[PDB]
């Protein structure tokens, strides 16, 4: 079995290997990359996502989210308070202000220490989940707006034609902005490209050990657990590495820098934080290996998780027994 310790693997494809996305994902899996839940892909030196980032300031962040924490430093939840719209140029200035800027630090490890010590005492503002793309239309390799769609994969694998679309999302981050512990909708893959700015630190639990994380989360968030049998679908809970180590949960960590891709694999729980002003783009995708994960994915039916239009069909076709109850949660 390849990668039996479920370490995060880092790949350096050549320009020739960068042509065929599906084939390279399947290659990475042949080497065991999925066992970690997360992989890094460093693009060939010849590749670029677009020519420059000089003209992005007029993008609108219609609903910036202030991430307010409750709990203790290593075990907290966050809620998202909606703020007034602002442009990317306005947000960048805000991120760089004395109130919100990255503190002085020695290295990524010192910054990680400061994040876990101090996150809860601040409420950073995240421009998340903005439909759109920063890939140049002429970028033919690993262009996250030109991937094969999940609806077409389901149709190729299972023969059923379904409604829905699959488009990318932009994330504009600042110091301390935080992504809570989650897997993807329907336990899909994700791919994330860090277009610019400061790094993003990731934590990940191997898919084969995801239920260990779920059991800890039910212990640590006991009211949330009684409210919903899949409350990590709410994307609000954080647990620190120190706490994970104290409770014996297997995980790994890695820092993504500008110009790098990360792939999350089906049922790979992940969480993380931004180091400073940055912009990422991410999208879900599927492969044939996902289908079985999609069929077994948990679902939130309490009403909190509220998701896209396109998840309807996935539930309806892969999980027809759950469909009725899940749809009640969506309505
Ligand atoms: O970058 C972020 O805030 C969150 N991204 C992801 O969870 C992802 O790409 O799967
Ligand atoms: Mg612009
Ligand atoms: Ni994710
Ligand atoms: Zn729920």
d(CA 178, CA 193): 17
Locate tokens 């790098």: which residue?
A: 260
d(CA 139, CA 145): 10
Q: For 71, which DSSP code?
A: E
197: alpha, beta or left? (left if phi > 0; alpha if psi -120 to 50): left
List, in sequence order, the alpha helices (H) in the chain.
21-30, 88-95, 108-118, 150-158, 210-220, 222-227, 241-246, 290-296, 311-318, 320-330
At 223 the three-state DSSP class reads helix
This structure's resolution (Å) is 1.5
Could you tell me the two tokens for 46? Answer: 């010849």
Render 150-199 in DSSP notation, one character per residue: HHHHHHHHH----------EEEEE-TT-EEEEE--GGG-EEEEEEEEES-
Using most ligand atoms within 8 A of CB, pick from 267, 270, 276, 281 the residue to mutate for ligand 1: 270
Neighbours of ion ligand 3 (CB under 5 A): 190
Using most ligand atoms within 8 A of CB, pick from 272, 275, 279, 283 the residue to mutate for ligand 1: 272
The vertex-315 CA angle with 227 and 162, nearest 5°, equals 155
d(CA 207, CA 191): 16
The structure's method of determination equals X-ray
Residues 6 or more apart in contact with residue 202 via CB below 8 angstroms:
38, 253, 254, 255, 256, 262, 270, 271, 272
Strand partners, 256: 200
- 3-state helix, strand, coil split of the chain in percent (to 5) is 30, 25, 45
Which residue lies with its CA nearest to atom 3 of ligand 1?
A: 179
Looking at CATH, the fold of the domain delimited by 1-331 is given as: Jelly Rolls (2.60.120)
93 annotated as ligand-binding: no
CA dihedral 88, 93, 97, 103 (to 10 degrees): 60
d(CA 137, CA 133): 9
Name the helix (H) or strand (E) containing 107.
Answer: none
d(CA 300, CA 324): 12
């Amino acid at each position: 079995a390849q990668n039996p310790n479920c370490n995060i693997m880092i790949f350096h494809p050549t320009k020739e290997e960068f042509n065929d996305f599906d084939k390279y994902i399947a290659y990475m899996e042949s080497q065991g990359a999925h066992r970690a839940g997360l992989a890094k892909i460093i693009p060939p030196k010849e590749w670029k996502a677009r020519e420059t980032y000089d003209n992005i300031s007029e993008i609108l962040i219609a609903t910036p989210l202030q991430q307010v924490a409750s709990g203790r430093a290593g075990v907290f939840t966050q809620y998202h308070k909606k703020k007034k719209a602002m442009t990317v140029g306005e947000y960048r200035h805000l991120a760089n202000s004395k109130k919100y800027q990255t503190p002085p630090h020695q290295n990524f490890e010192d910054l990680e220490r400061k994040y876990w010590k101090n996150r809860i005492y601040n409420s950073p503002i995240y421009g998340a989940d903005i439909s759109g793309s920063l890939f140049d239309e002429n970028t033919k390799q690993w262009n996250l707006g030109h991937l094969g769609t999940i609806q077409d994969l389901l149709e190729k694998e299972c023969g059923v034609v379904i409604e829905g679309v699959n488009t990318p999302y932009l994330y504009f981050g600042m110091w301390k902005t935080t992504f809570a512990w989650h897997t993807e909708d329907m336990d899909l893959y994700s791919i994330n490209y860090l277009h610019l700015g400061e790094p993003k630190t990731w934590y990940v639990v191997p898919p084969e050990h995801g239920q260990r994380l779920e059991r800890l989360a039910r212990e640590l968030f006991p009211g949330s657990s009684r409210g919903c049998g899949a409350f990590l679908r709410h994307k609000v809970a954080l647990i620190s590495p120190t706490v994970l180590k104290e409770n014996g949960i297997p995980f790994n960590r890695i820092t993504q820098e500008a110009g790098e891709f990360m792939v999350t694999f089906p049922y790979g729980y992940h969480a993380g934080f931004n180091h400073g002003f940055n912009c990422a783009e991410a999208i879900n995708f599927a492969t044939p290996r996902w289908i079985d994960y999609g069929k077994m994915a948990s679902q939130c039916s309490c009403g909190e998780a509220r998701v896209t239009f396109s998840m309807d069909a996935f539930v309806r076709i892969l999980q027809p027994e759950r469909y009725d109850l899940w749809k009640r949660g969506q309505d």
